[PDB]
Structure formats: structure tokens, C-alpha cells
Design a protein around this ligand. Structure first.
Ligand code: CHL
Ligand code: CLA
Ligand code: CLA
Ligand code: CLA
Ligand code: CLA
Ligand code: CLA
Ligand code: CLA
Ligand code: CLA
Ligand code: CLA
Ligand SMILES: CC1=C[C@H](O)CC(C)(C)C1/C=C/C(C)=C/C=C/C(C)=C/C=C/C=C(C)/C=C/C=C(C)/C=C/C1=C(C)C[C@H](O)CC1(C)C
Lengths: 41, 198, 194, 150, 91
């Protein structure tokens, strides 16, 4: 609705952004937990 | 008409198309500024040129070795031992010369007038006019350095770099050789791919 | 331009002697300072011209090392020697006093000069042969001096650096060490690892 | 490096041992085939994996029995500090560079504040991947890096 | 070593002062001038230089000069006297 799109991209843009970031971080950890170092070099 | 790296899209404006190998490919606007563009053009040249020899140097001996015409170690192995003089000596030598010949083309890049002083005596010079496209002894055969001819050099360089990028990454994970990697793929492609390896 | 294609700084018109327009830091922007510099370069050079031979010749004989000579001073009594003979004036306190007193006087004498420290080219008793009689000829010599002086300063350095790392100093010696197997013996080995 | 590698540290082994016994103790009440049991056995397996990796990656340990990090620059421990860090500075630089690309795109416009509280997502998505090559900020620095007015 | 060392050092120092470094030291004093707070310092201050005590019949030197050089002389000398008996030993 243009306008609805407009409600979005407000500080709802922050939460959608951080929720995506949180998810990504969580999955990484679930995949690679307890990492104290970068061991691939 | 120019070439579009992406058909639907339009080329950026700073890309006049007066440049060899121009397909309107600057999605990140690295070359929006003209100065940056000149520098980058020169950079692409050299990164492209070294890659040509390197890919060639790396690949061909591997192929010849398999043929059995000669025996040499795989590129990722030329390094350990077996040379008259150590590794250190070669380096310092490589460095002194590379340092001179470059700290050398650099001058021609800032200001294009470093063609004289050849040799120490000034009798011999380089006559011409394009940066990164020196003449004289550099071009013993005098092939026309035709624009479009330059187009070919770049394409090869660009191609070489994907190859080079390919060789190195391929090396890890694979632990073998590019020609070897190829044979494995060739022997049975559907069962040999990045998928089976990773 | 003596950096091949680099514009020369404003002050250096290449008229000075030894002027190759090199001053990436522009420590010479100030005329008063530069003049001081021209004087110093020569001083530093003059010594250096003297020092390399000083260091190099004895080693060809019994010097062993410029370093080695300094060795006695550390222990009491010295006495040190010039050519197998102790003294005269063997101990450190005597030499130190003689040096400090003899030197200070000569240099301070310098610090009583105008006309650009006699243009750092005093030419009094110093130019007996009077090479400086001819201006055209005099100029050529200055260039020789500076180029030679520079060559000397640079060499001294290498001696120190070479002397470093290779505390088994052998400025003349190292060269041998290089000569033997120049390929596996070079600074390169020194720039890296065991 | 007055420490001893974790692989050969008794205290480091005592901690892995004590931790597993604590989780196993809880294992008793739930019996076997059970949800909590599988959850606890999964923590135990996650525990063993953890300690195993630390030893495996040559991390020293302290008398405490816990790994300690070397940030001196020593080559054996770049994984401990330097490698991850460069990774950071890349990302931090990325975020900052993209953020500064947006303000400059926004600055010469209408009501500039309007796009600071209501994001121009088409514009942002256009500029996000420019951070990939943000260390070619260096080449902007050779010219238009920072303002001359101040 | 005897007390004679004191004399040579002090003697040499004095010598140095009177004939070598003497012209230069004064040149510097002239340039440095005396201290001034907003200008001069005698203006209040009760206290100002002693011109007479400063003045001497010798062609160049003054009593105060004697004091300083002699002091350096004595100090340098005592410096050598002490380093002797320490018998300090290093590698
Ligand atoms: C120009 C690009 C260049 C590149 C990309 C490499 C890459 C490499 N060098 Mg090489 N070098 C290069 C230049 C030079 N090297 C050497 C001297 C050596 C040595 C002496 C060695 C290498 C070795 C290696 C390899 C380490 C193996 C690895 O990590 O596998 C994953 C790696 C393939 C090592 C090697 O060959 O190990 C078998 C090795 O020992 N290089 C010299 C002169 C001294 C070079 C001069 O330009
Ligand atoms: C609803 C519950 C739920 C479930 C059952 C899963 C399940 C999974 N996720 Mg998802 N995820 C979820 C919610 C969920 N997720 C939410 C709410 C977010 C944030 C929006 C994410 C964001 C996310 C990311 C970024 C990724 C996953 C990935 C995965 C898979 C792991 C792939 C693998 O083989 O490991 C090993 C992979 C290696 C490379 C080793 C797995 C199927 C991964 C995937 O499959 O990519 C598409 C992946 O990286 N998830
Ligand atoms: C791309 C750049 C490149 C680089 C860095 C190297 C580097 C090297 N090559 Mg290679 N080579 C290259 C390109 C390159 N080559 C190309 C394009 C070809 C033709 C396909 C070859 C064909 C080749 C052969 C046949 C051999 C080498 C060998 C070597 C090694 C010794 C070189 C030497 O003796 O000094 C130069 C000295 C001269 C007298 C010349 C060294 C690792 C030798 C080797 O394998 O190790 C000993 C050797 O057998 N090269
Ligand atoms: C007659 C034989 C001869 C000899 C002994 C030399 C010797 C030398 N040349 Mg020269 N040169 C020659 C013929 C010769 N040249 C001819 C016929 C041409 C083209 C007409 C050139 C063009 C040339 C260039 C552009 C340069 C040299 C340079 C040099 C010096 C080092 C770089 C180099 O190997 O060559 C290359 C060296 C003193 C380099 C130099 O002097 O440093 C700037 C260099 O830049 N030469
Ligand atoms: C070899 C490098 C070199 C060169 C080319 C010069 C050149 C010059 N000097 Mg200099 N000088 C040098 C080294 C050098 N000097 C050293 C090492 C010192 C002491 C550290 C001095 C101390 C000195 C003083 C005090 C003066 C000069 C002056 C001059 C100028 C006039 C005299 C002359 O031409 O000498 C001719 C060149 C030679 C005689 C060759 C010398 C080689 C012999 C055999 C000496 C070898 C001795 C041995 C190695 C020890 C002229 C430009 C005078 C000047 O500037 O005029 C106003 C002046 O006052 N020089
Ligand atoms: C121009 C004067 C000069 C000369 C004739 C020499 C000559 C020599 N040097 Mg020395 N050096 C010099 C200056 C000089 N150096 C300076 C200024 C430094 C400080 C950076 C050094 C630091 C140095 C080291 C660490 C070593 C040498 C070594 C050597 C010997 C072998 C060459 C080499 O290993 O590396 C080539 C020389 C350089 C890379 C210095 C560059 C100087 C030229 C003029 C450029 C050879 C006798 C090596 C040795 O003693 O034999 C095993 C040794 O390992 N040099
Ligand atoms: C306190 C100030 C200080 C600073 C600024 C540094 C800085 C550095 N150290 Mg050092 N170090 C220090 C104190 C310090 N150290 C002390 C007190 C010790 C006693 C152990 C050490 C022991 C030490 C070791 C053993 C090593 C370093 C190394 C390094 C370099 C690693 C970064 C790099 O690889 O290049 C930058 C990489 C990118 C930009 C990518 C870096 C220059 C390493 C080195 O030498 O580098 C090759 C290394 O091997 N340090
Ligand atoms: C306070 C002012 C003062 C003055 C003017 C002197 C002066 C002197 N002291 Mg004395 N001293 C002082 C304070 C002073 N001292 C103090 C505070 C102490 C510690 C309490 C000492 C401890 C001391 C000792 C142990 C000795 C002296 C000695 C001397 C004589 C040194 C010989 C000499 O002249 O050198 C050079 C001689 C000349 C004639 C100078 C002429 C220069 C020519 C031209 C060169 C000289 C008369 C020495 C001495 O001989 O008897 C005491 C000596 O043994 N002093
Ligand atoms: C080592 C060199 C030296 C030193 C340290 C002195 C030190 C001194 N001189 Mg002397 N003088 C010297 C060389 C020296 N002179 C020479 C070479 C001459 C002749 C060229 C003189 C001619 C001379 C005269 C006429 C007088 C001094 C006087 C003095 C004293 C200044 C006044 C004073 O002390 O009490 C206040 C002071 C002790 C004055 C003096 O004797 O004090 C009573 C004095 O009138 N000097
Ligand atoms: C364009 C752009 C822009 C937009 O806007 C954005 C974007 C997209 C980002 C972009 C990007 C692009 C890219 C990707 C590029 C890349 C390149 C490369 C890769 C190169 C390489 C390159 C590469 C190279 C040089 C290489 C070289 C190599 C060599 C010589 C080698 C040699 C050798 C040999 C012989 C042998 C031995 O045994 C080894 C060695 C010794 C080693």
C-alpha cells in the first residue's frame, strides 16, 4: 500500500534487522558452539 | 553498442566505453572517480598479467608431468629445497630487482615521462604514448597494439584470475592438483564436483 | 631530479654541490637550517672518510676488529696498544682526558665562525696545496668530496649493521664469508630465519 | 607463557571430569529413555566436544585450569586474538562505511531528516554490498576522505 | 691517588674557562640577558645585582667566574677520585 510499506522501514526496520541478526548469530552458535578462537586460519 | 555485463541494466556513466574491456561493470562504484579509474585500469593490467604467467606456469608443468615428458614438482611444492642457493638469497634478489623495475612503472603512472635513461647512458629511449602499454624493446615484434587487440589481453587476464582464484581454493579441500582435479572430474563428473569434495 | 621523474623541491636548484634534489621531508625548507645542514653533512662525511680506513686497514693486519680494540678499555689496566706496544698513555682515564681536552678545543674553535663557518670550506692552513685556487676547479672537488663523503657514511653504517647480528664482526671478514658461498651467505639469511 | 598447554594440564582435565559427573548425577532421576535424559546427554556430549577442541587448538591453561589467551602477537595464537580481530575490523568498517554512504546519499535532499527516521530501503540495499570493498576507503582517503572546512 | 688530582682538574677547568670557552660563554650571557617579569625585575624587588663585586682588574675574568669553574673543577676531580677506589668491576 505504499503507505504500509511506509509504516515499515521506521524503527520496525531496526527490529526486523536485529531479529534477523539474532537469528543468524544463534544459528551460528548452534552450529559452532563454545568457540573461543578462530581455528581455521 | 558496448557490452552489458548485465543485459537489463544500464552502464554507469563514468564508463564511457572508450576503454578496452568495458562492459559497464562497476556495481560498487569503485571507479566512479576518474583518478581511481586510471589507477584501477593499470592495476587490472598487472594483476591480470601476472596471473597469466602464473596460471600458465602452474598448470602446464603439471600437465607435462602427467604426460611424462618431464618431471617437476607440483606448483605448491616448488618451494621446498632443491635449488642452487637458498630461498633467502633468491628473495632478496627478487626483491631488489622487482623493487627497481617497479618503483619504476610507478613513475610513468604519475607523470608519463620516465622513458629515457636507457641504459645508464642516454642513447636509447622508449617512444610512444599509453600508460601500461610501453613500447620499444618491450615490443620486439611490433604487433600493432591495436585497441581491440588490448581487448584480448584483458579478457585473458580476467580469465586468468578466475583460474588463479580457482587453483588456490581448489588446492585446499582438494589437496591435489588442478590437472588432477580435472582428471577426477573428467573420469566421472557427476560424482566428482564441489559437492562430493566439501 | 635524482629520483627519476619526481619534481625537484623549490629550494634546490641543483647549484649546490652534491645537490641531487633529495629531501623527501623538506627538512631544508628553512634556509637558516639548510645551511647548517650543508655544514653538518660535510662534517659527518669528513669523519666517515677517515673512519672506514681507520676500521678497515688494521683488520687487514692485526686489528681483528674495530670492536676488538675497544675491548681492553673495559678491564682494569688496559693497557691497550697500537702495534704490540703498550702505552704510551695506555690507561683509559688518560686517554679520556686527552681526548676530551684535545677535541673540545678544536671543535669549539669551529663554534666561533661567521661567513657560514667560512663556508664550511675554511681553506686556511687547510688548503696548503691550495686546490681551491681555481673556482671552476674548486667546485668539481667539492662534488668529489660530497659524493665520496656520502659513500663513506653509507659504508660505515653497513659496518655497524653488519657488525650487529654478526657480533663475530668481520667487516672485511664478512666479505670473505660472502665470497666463499655468496649464494647461501648473504644478508638474506640474516633477514630471515634459522 | 608461564603456563602449561591445556592438553597437558591436570587442572584442565579435572574440570572436564567434574563437570561431566555433575550432569551425570542429574541423569539418575530421569531414568533412561527420556526427554530430560536425552537433553542432559546432549549437554554432556557438548561438554566433551568443548574441552576437546580447546586442547586440540593448543590453548595454554592457567593454574586455575582454564585457558588463557595470548594477545602479544605470538604466531601460535593468532587464532586467540589477531585473526578474529581483523575479522571484526572488516565488519565494523563495513557497517560504518555503508552507514556513511547513506548519509552522503541522503544529505543533498529535500528534508534530509525524513530519510533518517524513515529508511530508504531501496537505497540502503543498493549500498550495503559496497562495504564488501570498504577498505578501498583508503583510495578515497587519498583525495576526498574527510572535510577540509574543519 | 693524592690530593694533587684536585689541583690539575681545577687548574685545567679554570684554564678552560679563562682562555677557551670564555668568549662564547659571555656571548651567550649577553643574549640571555637577565630575568624580567613584564620587564627587568628590579622594579619593586629590593634585590638587584652587585655591580662592584662583579668587577675585576684582570683583563677579562671576575671572581664569580672563578667560583664556578673551580667548582666544576673540584667536582670533576672528586668524580675521578671516587671512581678510582670503588674498584667497581663489570663483565
Ligand atoms: C607469488 C606468489 C606466491 C605464492 C602464492 C606462494 C605460495 C606458496 N609458497 Mg611460495 N609462494 C609465492 C612466492 C614465493 N614462494 C617462495 C618460496 C617458498 C618456499 C621456500 C616455500 C613456499 C611454499 C609455499 C606454499 C605453502 C603451502 C600451503 O600453505 O598449503 C596449503 C604456498 C603454495 C612452501 C612450500 O613449497 O611447501 C611445500 C615452502 O616451503 N614458497 C618464493 C621465493 C623464496 C617466492 C617468491 O616470490
Ligand atoms: C522454526 C524452527 C527452526 C528449525 C527447525 C530450523 C532448522 C535449521 N535451520 Mg533455521 N532459523 C530459524 C528457525 C529454525 N531453523 C529462525 C527463526 C531463524 C532466523 C530468521 C533461522 C535462521 C537460519 C540461518 C541463517 C540458517 C539456518 C539453518 C538451519 C538448518 C541447519 C542446516 C545444517 O545442515 O547445519 C550445518 C551447515 C553447515 C554449513 C555446516 C536447519 C534445518 C542453516 C541453513 O540450512 O541455511 C539455509 C542456516 O545457516 N536457520
Ligand atoms: C608464472 C610465473 C612463474 C613462476 C614464479 C615460476 C617458478 C618456477 N618455475 Mg616455472 N614456468 C612458467 C612460469 C613460472 N614459473 C611458465 C609460464 C612455464 C611454461 C609453461 C614454466 C615452465 C617451467 C619448467 C619446465 C620448470 C619451471 C621451474 C620453476 C621453478 C624454478 C625456476 C627457475 O629455475 O628459475 C629460472 C632459471 C633459469 C635458468 C630460467 C620455479 C618455482 C622448474 C622447476 O620445476 O623447479 C626446478 C622447471 O622444471 N617452470
Ligand atoms: C647495445 C647494447 C645494450 C646494453 C649493454 C644495454 C644496457 C642497459 N640497458 Mg638498454 N637498450 C638497448 C641496448 C642496450 N642496453 C637498445 C637497442 C634499446 C632500444 C633501442 C634499449 C632500451 C632500454 C630501456 C628502456 C632501458 C634500457 C636499460 C638498460 C640498463 C639496464 C636494464 C636492461 O637490461 O636493459 C633494458 C642497462 C645498462 C634500462 C635503463 O637504463 O634504466 C632506466 C631501461 O630503462 N635499455
Ligand atoms: C676523498 C674525498 C675528499 C675530496 C674529493 C675532498 C676535497 C676537498 N677538500 Mg676534503 N677532507 C676529506 C676528504 C675529501 N676532500 C677528509 C676525509 C677530511 C678529514 C675528515 C677532509 C678535510 C678537509 C678540510 C679541513 C678541507 C678540505 C678541503 C677540500 C677542498 C680542497 C682540497 C682538495 O681538493 O682535496 C684534494 C683531494 C685529495 C688530495 C685526495 C686525497 C687522498 C689522499 C692520498 C689522502 C689519503 C690519506 C689516507 C687515506 C689517510 C676539496 C673540495 C678544504 C676546503 O674546502 O677549502 C676551503 C679544507 O679546508 N677537506
Ligand atoms: C654499500 C655498502 C655496502 C657493501 C659493499 C656491503 C657488502 C656486504 N654486505 Mg652489507 N649492509 C649495508 C651496506 C653494504 N654492505 C648497509 C647500509 C646495511 C644496513 C641495512 C647492511 C646490512 C648487511 C647484513 C645483515 C649483511 C650484509 C652482508 C654483506 C656481504 C654480503 C652481501 C649481503 O649479504 O647482502 C647485500 C647487501 C645489502 C642488502 C645492503 C644494501 C647496501 C647496498 C649498497 C644497496 C657483503 C660484504 C651479509 C654478510 O655479512 O655476509 C654473509 C649480511 O648478512 N649487509
Ligand atoms: C606492548 C606493545 C607491543 C606491540 C604494539 C606489539 C605488536 C606486535 N607484535 Mg609483540 N610482544 C610484546 C609487545 C608488543 N607487541 C611483548 C611485551 C612480548 C613478549 C612476548 C611480545 C611478543 C611477540 C611475539 C612472539 C610476536 C609478536 C608479534 C607482534 C606483531 C603481530 C602483528 C602482526 O602480525 O602484524 C599485522 C598483521 C596484519 C595487519 C594482518 C605486532 C607488530 C608477532 C610478530 O612478530 O609479527 C610477525 C610475533 O611473532 N610479539
Ligand atoms: C670554596 C672555595 C675553594 C677554593 C678557591 C679552593 C682551592 C683549592 N683547593 Mg679546595 N676544597 C673546597 C673549596 C675550595 N678550594 C671545599 C669546599 C672542599 C671540601 C670541604 C675542598 C677540598 C680540597 C682538597 C682535598 C684539596 C683542595 C685543594 C685546593 C687547591 C687546588 C690546587 C689548584 O689550584 O689547582 C691548580 C693550581 C693552580 C695554581 C691553578 C692555576 C691554573 C694554571 C694557570 C693552569 C686550591 C688552592 C688541593 C690542595 O692542594 O690543598 C687543599 C687539595 O688537596 N680542596
Ligand atoms: C688560569 C687563568 C687565569 C685565572 C683562573 C685568573 C684568575 C683571576 N685573576 Mg688573572 N690573569 C691571567 C690569567 C688568569 N687569571 C693572565 C694570563 C693575565 C695577564 C694577561 C692576568 C692578569 C690579571 C690581573 C691584573 C688581575 C687578575 C685578577 C684575577 C682574579 C680576579 C679578581 C679576584 O679574584 O678577586 C676580586 C682571579 C683569581 C685580579 C686579581 O688579581 O684580584 C685581586 C687582577 O687584578 N688577573
Ligand atoms: C571488478 C570488481 C568491481 C565491482 O564493482 C565489485 C567487484 C565485483 C567486487 C569487483 C571484483 C572483481 C574481482 C573478483 C577481481 C579479482 C581478481 C583476481 C582474483 C585476481 C587474481 C590474480 C592472481 C594473480 C596475480 C596470481 C599470480 C600467481 C602467480 C604469478 C604464481 C606464480 C607461481 C608459479 C608460476 C609456480 C609456483 O609453484 C607457485 C607460484 C610461485 C605462486
Amino acid at each position: 500500500r505504499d503507505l504500509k510499506t511506509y509504516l515499515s522501514v521506521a524503527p520496525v526496520a531496526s527490529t526486523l534487522w536485529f531479529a534477523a541478526l539474532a537469528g543468524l548469530l544463534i544459528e551460528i552458535n548452534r552450529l559452532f558452539p563454545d568457540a573461543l578462537t578462530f581455528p581455521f586460519f | 553498442k558496448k557490452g552489458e555485463w548485465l543485459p537489463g541494466l544500464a552502464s554507469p556513466g563514468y564508463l564511457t566505453g572508450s576503454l578496452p574491456g568495458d562492459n559497464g561493470f562497476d556495481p560498487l562504484g569503485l571507479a566512479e572517480d576518474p583518478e581511481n579509474l586510471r589507477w584501477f585500469v593499470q592495476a587490472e593490467l598487472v594483476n591480470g598479467r601476472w596471473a597469466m604467467l602464473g596460471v600458465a606456469g602452474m598448470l602446464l608443468p603439471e600437465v607435462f608431468t602427467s604426460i611424462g615428458i618431464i618431471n617437476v614438482p607440483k606448483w605448491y611444492d616448488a618451494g621446498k629445497e632443491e635449488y642452487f642457493a637458498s630461498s633467502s638469497t633468491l628473495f632478496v634478489i627478487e626483491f631488489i630487482l622487482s623493487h627497481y623495475v617497479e618503483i619504476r612503472r610507478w613513475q610513468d603512472i604519475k607523470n608519463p615521462g620516465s622513458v629515457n635513461q636507457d641504459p645508464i647512458f642516454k642513447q636509447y629511449s622508449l617512444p610512444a604514448g599509453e600508460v601500461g602499454y610501453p613500447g620499444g624493446i618491450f615490443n620486439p615484434l611490433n604487433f600493432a597494439p591495436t585497441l581491440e587487440a588490448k581487448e584480448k589481453e584483458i579478457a585473458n587476464g580476467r580469465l586468468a584470475m578466475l583460474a588463479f582464484l580457482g587453483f588456490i581454493i581448489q588446492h585446499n579441500v582438494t589437496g591435489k592438483g588442478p590437472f588432477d582435479n580435472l582428471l577426477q572430474h573428467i573420469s566421472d563428473p557427476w560424482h566428482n564436483t564441489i559437492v562430493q569434495t566439501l | 631530479d635524482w629520483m627519476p621523474g619526481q619534481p625537484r623541491p623549490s629550494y634546490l636548484d641543483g647549484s649546490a654541490p652534491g645537490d641531487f634534489g633529495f629531501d623527501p621531508l623538506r627538512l631544508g625548507e628553512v634556509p637558516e637550517n639548510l645551511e647548517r645542514f650543508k655544514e653538518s653533512e660535510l662534517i659527518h662525511c669528513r669523519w666517515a672518510m677517515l673512519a672506514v680506513p681507520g676500521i678497515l686497514v688494521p683488520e687487514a693486519l692485526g686489528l681483528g676488529n674495530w670492536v676488538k680494540a675497544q675491548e681492553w678499555a673495559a678491564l682494569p689496566g688496559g693497557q691497550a696498544t697500537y702495534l704490540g706496544n703498550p702505552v704510551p698513555w695506555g690507561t683509559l682515564p688518560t686517554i679520556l682526558v686527552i681526548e676530551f681536552l684535545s677535541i673540545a678545543f678544536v671543535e669549539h674553535q669551529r663554534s666561533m665562525e661567521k661567513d657560514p663557518e667560512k663556508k664550511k670550506y675554511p681553506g686556511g692552513a687547510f688548503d696548503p696545496l691550495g686546490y681551491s685556487k681555481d673556482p671552476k676547479k674548486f667546485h668539481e672537488y667539492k662534488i668529489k668530496e660530497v659524493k665520496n663523503g656520502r659513500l663513506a657514511l653509507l659504508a660505515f653504517v653497513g659496518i655497524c649493521v653488519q657488525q650487529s647480528a654478526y657480533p663475530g664482526t668481520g667487516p672485511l671478514e664478512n666479505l670473505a664469508t660472502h665470497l666463499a658461498d655468496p649464494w647461501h651467505n648473504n644478508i638474506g639469511i640474516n633477514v630471515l630465519i634459522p | 607463557s608461564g603456563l602449561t598447554p591445556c592438553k597437558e594440564s591436570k587442572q584442565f582435565a579435572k574440570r572436564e571430569k567434574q563437570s561431566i559427573k555433575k550432569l551425570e548425577s542429574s541423569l539418575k532421576i530421569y531414568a533412561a529413555d527420556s526427554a530430560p535424559a536425552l537433553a542432559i546427554n546432549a549437554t554432556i556430549e557438548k561438554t566433551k566436544r568443548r574441552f576437546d577442541n580447546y586442547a586440540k587448538q593448543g590453548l595454554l591453561c592457567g593454574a586455575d585450569g582454564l585457558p588463557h589467551l595470548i594477545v602479544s602477537g605470538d604466531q601460535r595464537h593468532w587464532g586467540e586474538f589477531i585473526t578474529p580481530g581483523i575479522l571484526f575490523l572488516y565488519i565494523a568498517g563495513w557497517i560504518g562505511w555503508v552507514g556513511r554512504s547513506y548519509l552522503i546519499a541522503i544529505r543533498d535532499e529535500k528534508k534530509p531528516t525524513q530519510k533518517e527516521i524513515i529508511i530508504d530501503v531501496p537505497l540502503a540495499s543498493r549500498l550495503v554490498f559496497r562495504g564488501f570493498s570498504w577498505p578501498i576507503a583508503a583510495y578515497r582517503e587519498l583525495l576526498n576522505g574527510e572535510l577540509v572546512a574543519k | 691517588n693524592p690530593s694533587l688530582v684536585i689541583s690539575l682538574s681545577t687548574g685545567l677547568s679554570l684554564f678552560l674557562g679563562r682562555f677557551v670557552f670564555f668568549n662564547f660563554q659571555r656571548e651567550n650571557v649577553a643574549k640571555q640577558g637577565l630575568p624580567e617579569q613584564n620587564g627587568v625585575t628590579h622594579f619593586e624587588a629590593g634585590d638587584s645585582r652587585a655591580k662592584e663585586y662583579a668587577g675585576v682588574s684582570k683583563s677579562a675574568a671576575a671572581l664569580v667566574d672563578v667560583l664556578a669553574w673551580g667548582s666544576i673543577g673540584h667536582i670533576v676531580a672528586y668524580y675521578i677520585l671516587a671512581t678510582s677506589s670503588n674498584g667497581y668491576d663489570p663483565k
